[PDB]
């Protein structure tokens, strides 16, 4: 497994190059409950295709069986979409940048039931990222950690060995940025604790999506349905 052989710099470099593109939403401005969830479902369905190919580039992910890869993506897919959201929305306080042509605030989420709560949580996460001055190299580490950790409790040593490698990478980045030893394990702790909130927001998102599937208040795509039926 070449993933374990990578240096911290080689780890960061591989993850930065693997980054999915920032996709755009469908155009012609004008927001109803149907139109909003329509755009987001469309947007997510397209991001999933890049995510899957991004996951293949995450060091160590290819070493897993096909079944394991499926399961890890099925568990983490909404988390990964969400941490992407709060990251690119970072320098837009009070706003969520779903797409460069789709910037939403808390007021917009209210036109959909139970959407305001998840919005406020996402905004809070983004504000947390902004407060910590999260770096891109840290972000791509967190995202990959989410991919490998979120489903690993449902071979196994390999994922743990890769998880430790990314930890070393995060510490290396911080030590390079001049952080003291104490500042390194505090910041590491602060970062990983966010993943608990991201997990929570995902779970809340899943409920909402399963809700609108049992209401037809937007038609989900066939790939998005399969991802959702994995959390039934």
């Amino acid at each position: 497994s070449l993933a374990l052989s990578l240096t911290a710099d080689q780890m960061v470099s591989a993850l930065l190059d693997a980054e999915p593109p920032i996709l755009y939403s469908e155009y012609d401005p004008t927001f109803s409950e149907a139109s909003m969830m329509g755009l987001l479902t469309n947007l997510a369905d397209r991001e999933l295709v890049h995510m899957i190919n991004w996951a293949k580039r995450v060091p160590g992910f290819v070493d897993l069986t096909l079944h394991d890869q499926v399961h890890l993506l099925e568990c983490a897919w909404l988390e990964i979409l969400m941490i992407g959201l709060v990251w690119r929305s970072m320098e837009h306080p009070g706003k969520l940048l779903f797409a460069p042509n789709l910037l939403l605030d808390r007021n917009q989420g209210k036109c959909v039931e139970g959407m305001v709560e998840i919005f406020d949580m996402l905004l809070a996460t983004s504000s947390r990222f902004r407060m910590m001055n999260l770096q891109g190299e840290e972000f791509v580490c967190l995202k990959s950690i989410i991919l490998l950790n979120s489903g690993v409790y449902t071979e196994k040593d390999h994922i743990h060995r890769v998880l430790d490698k990314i930890t070393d990478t995060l510490i290396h980045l911080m030590a390079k940025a001049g952080l003291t030893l104490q500042q390194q394990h505090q910041r590491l702790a602060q970062l990983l604790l966010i993943l608990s909130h991201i997990r929570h927001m995902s779970n809340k998102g899943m409920e909402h999506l399963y809700s609108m599937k049992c209401k037809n208040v937007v038609p989900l795509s066939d790939l998005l349905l399969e991802m959702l039926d994995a959390h039934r």
Binding site: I52, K56, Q69, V70, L73, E74, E226
Partner: peptide, 10 residues
């Protein structure tokens, strides 16, 4: 099987 299987192989 599922779509995810195909996208992970293609």
């Amino acid at each position: 099987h599922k779509i995810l299987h195909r996208l992970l192989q293609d």
